[PDB]
């Protein structure tokens, strides 16, 4: 199995930037390397084949170079429709293999999240389960840390997070984290809080409530 | 124009079988090698299998060798992937892809055209409509001029669900998050929107949740608590 390692795994860039993505193969593969572009929920599209040949219909700002073990995909002037995930792919031997992909993201200014916490509705408690939702709204960059605390004790292994793609209007991220526990456990504790750490916040920000609107 | 229309996806119990189809048009199908590629939810592209123009040479990825069979019908211009003994790791969107040049042209192989993809979910979970719960902001909140509210779309199977707000008349500030898979095998999703704090008890906010695989439509009004 020929392994393809892309770098970086993601990068933030602006419209007009020169962008460079590297692909490294575990053994020499001559010029048997292709590049694909994929956008969320769409099929990949071929950009470059045989290391440096431009696929028909692909704009000339895309170019490929390299040979042997080191390959490069270059976008000479990044356009808005170029934010996407890029994959290298080797056809030197079987099985065919792919790089892990490089996500080209939109660069912008740091933005602190606005943090909101939601208690479980009484309607949900009737089913026997309680969900406590922490929302982080419109922040950048994507990296953020969410800590759940119950009666001031740091939780782990009982939450799940989900993050949106970059907003089409302001290029920010939003994140929702859900703490899940039974109604019986929810009734046995008073203080529920999520603490958010992010580059835009001088100190971590905590949103809390007391069970029963106390 | 080259077309590759795929079908045959859906939910399959673990250990069962499923046949995928890829109908080709707009090129001479029987002189082209064809491939299957898959992509697990949130993951990278992963090569699956290849079949030569005449069906004679077939090769498979290490993780599917033995279980998967690739085949073709050069009269119907259709590519097939028989998938047997499915595991949770086989859950993915499956693409078919056409080689760039006829098989008898000796060039670097590249996948110059791909099908739209068909989703295969390997799971024993039963189809279930979602429960929609309100994510209500507090009535006595004083922290800002903007408030967030939302809907918690919990315990449905399978994907996907659609969430709009006020029948689509509210799109500004709306964030519908990717679903997450819980340890019960059911999916969970949140859709939120930020609105003027002064609007909460005056403007009516309704999240519209539709889940086709169960023909379930739920309209939930989200109001402040207490």
CATH code at position A55: 2.60.40.10
Domain boundary among A106, A140, A161: A106
Is A1 near chain B, with CB under 8 Å? yes
With tokens 């929302």, the residue in question is: A135
Assess whether A78 and A160 both reside in one domain: no
Q: Is A138 left (phi over 0), alpha (psi -120 to 50) or beta?
A: left
> Which residue shows structure tokens 């953020």?
A144
Contacts of B189 in chain A (CB under 8 A): 162
Closest by CA to A133, choosing from A182, A194, A186, is: A194
Does A119 lie in the same domain as A98? no
A191 neighbors A179 (Cβ within 8 angstroms): no
Contacts of B147 (CB under 8 A, 6+ apart): B137, B141, B194, B195, B196, B197, B200
Same-domain check for residues A9 and A100: yes
How far is the alpha carbon of B94 from chain A, nearest alpha carbon, in Å?
10
Resolution in A: 2.0
Q: In the PDB record, what is the listed experimental method?
A: X-ray
- My answer on whether A21 and A97 are in the same domain is yes
Closest Cα of chain B to A203: distance in Å? 17
Q: Does A164 touch chain B (CB under 8 A)?
A: yes
Count CB neighbours of B161 within 10 A. 23
Closest residue in A to B190 (Cα–Cα): A176
Count the Cβ atoms, other than its own, within 10 Å of residue B85: 13
Domain spanning B131-222: CATH superfamily:
Immunoglobulins (2.60.40.10)
Cα–Cα nearest to B170, from B222, B119, B114: B222
Domain B3-122: give its CATH code. 2.60.40.10
The conformation of residue B157, written as its DSSP 8-state character, comes to: B
Give which of A213, A203, A182, A214 is closest to A115, Cα–Cα: A203
Contacts of residues A81-85 at CB distance under 8 Å and 24 or more positions apart, as own/partner, are A82/A19, A82/A37, A83/A166, A84/A37, A84/A38, A84/A39, A85/A37, A85/A38, A85/A39
Cβ proximity of A155 and A134 under 8 Å: no
Among A200, A119, A14, A122, residue whose Cα is nearest residue B141: A119
Neighbours of B67 (CB within 10 A): 15
Candidates B44, B136, B226; nearest CB to A118: B136
Same domain? For A121 and A201 the reply is yes
**Chain B residues touching residue A93 (CB < 8 angstroms):** none
Same domain, A120 and A99: no
A133 and A92 share a domain?
no
DSSP strand E in chain A: where? 4-7, 10-13, 19-25, 33-38, 45-49, 53-54, 62-67, 70-75, 84-90, 97-98, 102-106, 114-118, 129-139, 145-150, 153-154, 159-163, 173-182, 191-197, 205-210
Domain span(s) for CATH 2.60.40.10 in chain B: 3-122, 131-222
Q: Does residue A128 share a domain with residue A70?
A: no
Does A52 contact B at CB distance below 8 Å? no
Domain stops at, among A79, A106, A133:
A106
Beta-carbon separation of A121 and B134 below 8 A: yes
Instruction: Tokens for A199, please give them.
Output: 């580059």
Q: Is any Cβ of chain B less than 8 angstroms from the Cβ of A124?
A: yes
HSE value, Cβ hemisphere, 13 Å, CA-based, for B53? 13
Per the structure, the complete domain to which residue A40 belongs is given by: 4-106
Give yes or no: residues A19 and A77 share one domain. Answer: yes
When CB atoms are compared, the residue of B35, B112, B189 closest to A46 is B112
> Which one of A89, A106, A123 terminates a domain?
A106
């Amino acid at each position: 199995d020929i392994q393809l390692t892309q770098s970086p795994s993601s990068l933030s860039a602006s419209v007009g930037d020169r962008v460079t993505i590297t692909c490294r193969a575990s053994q020499s593969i001559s010029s048997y390397l292709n590049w694909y572009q994929q956008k969320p929920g769409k099929a990949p599209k071929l950009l470059i084949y045989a290391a440096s040949s431009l696929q028909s219909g692909v704009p000339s700002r895309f170019s490929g170079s390299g040979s042997g073990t080191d390959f490069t995909l270059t976008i000479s002037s990044l356009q808005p429709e170029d934010f996407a995930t890029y994959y290298c792919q080797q056809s030197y031997s079987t099985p065919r293999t792919f790089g892990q992909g490089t996500k080209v993201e939109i660069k912008r200014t740091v933005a602190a999240p606005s943090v909101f916490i939601f208690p479980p509705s009484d309607e949900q408690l009737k089913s026997g389960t309680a969900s406590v939702v922490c929302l982080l709204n419109n922040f950048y960059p994507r990296e953020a840390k969410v800590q759940w605390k119950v009666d001031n004790a740091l939780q782990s292994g009982n939450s799940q997070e989900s993050v949106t793609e970059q907003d089409s209007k302001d290029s920010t991220y939003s994140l929702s984290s859900t703490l899940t526990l039974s109604k019986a456990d929810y009734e046995k504790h008073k203080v529920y809080a999520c603490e958010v750490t992010h580059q835009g916040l001088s100190s971590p920000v905590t949103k809390s409530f007391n069970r029963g609107e106390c | 124009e080259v077309q590759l229309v795929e079908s045959g996806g859906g939910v399959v119990q673990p250990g069962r079988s499923l046949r995928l189809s890829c109908a080709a048009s707009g090129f001479t199908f029987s002189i082209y090698g064809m491939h299957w590629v898959r992509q697990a939810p949130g993951k990278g592209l992963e090569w699956v299998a290849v079949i030569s123009y005449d069906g004679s040479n077939k090769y498979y990825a290490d993780s599917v060798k033995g279980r998967f069979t690739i085949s073709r019908d050069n009269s119907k211009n259709t590519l097939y992937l028989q998938m047997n003994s499915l595991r949770a790791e086989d859950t993915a969107v499956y693409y078919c892809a056409k080689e760039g040049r006829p098989s008898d042209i000796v060039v670097v192989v590249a996948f110059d055209y791909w099908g739209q993809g068909t989703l295969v979910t390997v799971s024993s979970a039963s189809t279930k409509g979602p429960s929609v719960f309100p994510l209500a902001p507090s009535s006595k909140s004083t922290s800002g001029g903007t408030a967030a509210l939302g809907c918690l779309v919990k315990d449905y199977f399978p994907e996907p669900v659609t969430v709009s707000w006020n029948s689509g008349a509210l799109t500004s500030g709306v964030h519908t998050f990717p679903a997450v898979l819980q340890s019960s095998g059911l999916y969970s999703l949140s859709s939120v929107v930020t609105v003027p704090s002064s609007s909460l008890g005056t403007q009516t906010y309704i999240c519209n949740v539709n889940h086709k695989p169960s023909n379930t439509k739920v309209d939930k009004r989200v109001e402040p608590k207490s």
